[PDB]
C-alpha cells in the first residue's frame, strides 16, 4: 500500500507469501489456539525441511506443488480482518471522507466559525505554493532521461526542501474522518 512495487517477485518473496497464506488458512481451519499452534509448528517444520535446497529447479517444483496443495486444501471461507479488502468493514467509512479542497468553497459565514483552523490552513497553503517549484525541479534532476523506472520517489535533500509530491499524501482525509 505504501511501497512502490517491483517488476516481479523473487522466489523468496513467493515462498514467504505462501507461508503466510498457508498459516492463515490453517488458523481458519484450526479454530482453537492450542490446536492451531500445534499444526502451525508442524507447518513450520514441513516448511523448514526444504530450507537449504540449492537446486533452483527442484525448489521451484516444490513451490508449485505446494501451491497446488494450498489451492485444493484452502478454506472456502477464511477469516478476514474486518477492514481488509474482503472484510465486513472494508470500505465502511469512505462515505465520510471529504477532500480538503472543499473547504475553500465554504461560505465566509461558515469560516467565521473556526478562525484559527483556517489561519493555519492558509499557512499550509502558503507552504505548498512555495515548495512546488523546487519539488518539480528536484524530480527533473533526479530522474533518468528515459523517464522513471519505478514508482519510487526521492526524499528532500537540501535545507528547507520538502519531499516531492507530498501534498496529497500528507493531507489524507483520515481513516475515521467523522
Amino acid at each position: 500500500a505504501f511501497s512502490a512495487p517491483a517488476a516481479y517477485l523473487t522466489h523468496q518473496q513467493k515462498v514467504l507469501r505462501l507461508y503466510k497464506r498457508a498459516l492463515r488458512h490453517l488458523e481458519s481451519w484450526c479454530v482453537h489456539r492450542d490446536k492451531y499452534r500445534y499444526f502451525a509448528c508442524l507447518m513450520r517444520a514441513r516448511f523448514d525441511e526444504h530450507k537449504n535446497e540449492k537446486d533452483m529447479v527442484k525448489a521451484t517444483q516444490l513451490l508449485r506443488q505446494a501451491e497446488e496443495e494450498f489451492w485444493y486444501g484452502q478454506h472456502p471461507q477464511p477469516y478476514i480482518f474486518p477492514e481488509s479488502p474482503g472484510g465486513t468493514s472494508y470500505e465502511r467509512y469512505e462515505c465520510y471522507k471529504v477532500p480538503e479542497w472543499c473547504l475553500d468553497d465554504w461560505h465566509p459565514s461558515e469560516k467565521a466559525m473556526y478562525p484559527d483552523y483556517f489561519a493555519k490552513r492558509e499557512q499550509w497553503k502558503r507552504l505548498r505554493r512555495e515548495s512546488w517549484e523546487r519539488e518539480v525541479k528536484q524530480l527533473q534532476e533526479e530522474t533518468p532521461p528515459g523517464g522513471p523506472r519505478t514508482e519510487a520517489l526521492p526524499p528532500a535533500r537540501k535545507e528547507g526542501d520538502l519531499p516531492p509530491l507530498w501534498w496529497h499524501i500528507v493531507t489524507r482525509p483520515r481513516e475515521r474522518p467523522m
Binding site: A1, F2, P5, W71, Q74, P76, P85, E91, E94
Partner: protein, 156 residues
C-alpha cells in the same frame, strides 16, 4: 488537447501500423493484440485479458481505488461489465463444471423427489370428515330451490 491521431482507428495489418497502435494505447508491441478483423467494428482497439476489476490487487495504490484503475492505462472494452458491482471472474475454490454439476444434481433430485412424494402422499388412517346439513349445501353457495341429494351419515 486530445488530437486526431490519439483516437482508435481501423484494424492494423502492417507491423508498423501495429507498432503505432501499441504506442498509442501505452502498451508493449509484444502485448498489444487487437480483436480479430471481422466486421464487428472493434477495429483498432486492443483486446485486453478478460479478468474482472475484482481480480486486481486491492493492496496496490490505484489512482481510482474503488474502480482499481490507473490514469492513462488502457481500459478494457468491457470495463462497465466488470466494474465489480457486476460480473466477477475471480477464481473460485471449487471448479466451474463441478459447482454446476452439484447444483443441477441437487435441484433435479429435489424436483424428482417432490413429484414422487406427490404420487405417494402421507395421510392418517381416517375417514373423510363429515358435515351435517347435506355437507353444508346451503352454506357453500346454496341455491335453496333445488333439493340437494341427501347426504346422511351414520354412527359407528
Amino acid at each position: 488537447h486530445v488530437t486526431k491521431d490519439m483516437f482508435p482507428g481501423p484494424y492494423p495489418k502492417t507491423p508498423e501500423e501495429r507498432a503505432a497502435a501499441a504506442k498509442k494505447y501505452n502498451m508493449r508491441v509484444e502485448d498489444y493484440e487487437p480483436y480479430p478483423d471481422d466486421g464487428m467494428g472493434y477495429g483498432d482497439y486492443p483486446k485486453l485479458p478478460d479478468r474482472s476489476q475484482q481480480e486486481r490487487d486491492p493492496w496496490y495504490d490505484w489512482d481510482h481505488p474503488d474502480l482499481r484503475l490507473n490514469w492513462g492505462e488502457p481500459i478494457h472494452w468491457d470495463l462497465d461489465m466488470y466494474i465489480r458491482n457486476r460480473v466477477d471472474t475471480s477464481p473460485t475454490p471449487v471448479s466451474w463444471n463441478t459447482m454446476c454439476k452439484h447444483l443441477f444434481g441437487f435441484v433435479a433430485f429435489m424436483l424428482f423427489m417432490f413429484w414422487v412424494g406427490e404420487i405417494y402422499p402421507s395421510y392418517q388412517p381416517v375417514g373423510p370428515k363429515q358435515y351435517p346439513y347435506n355437507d353444508l349445501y346451503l352454506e357453500r353457495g346454496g341455491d335453496p330451490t333445488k333439493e340437494p341429494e341427501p347426504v346422511v351419515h351414520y354412527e359407528i
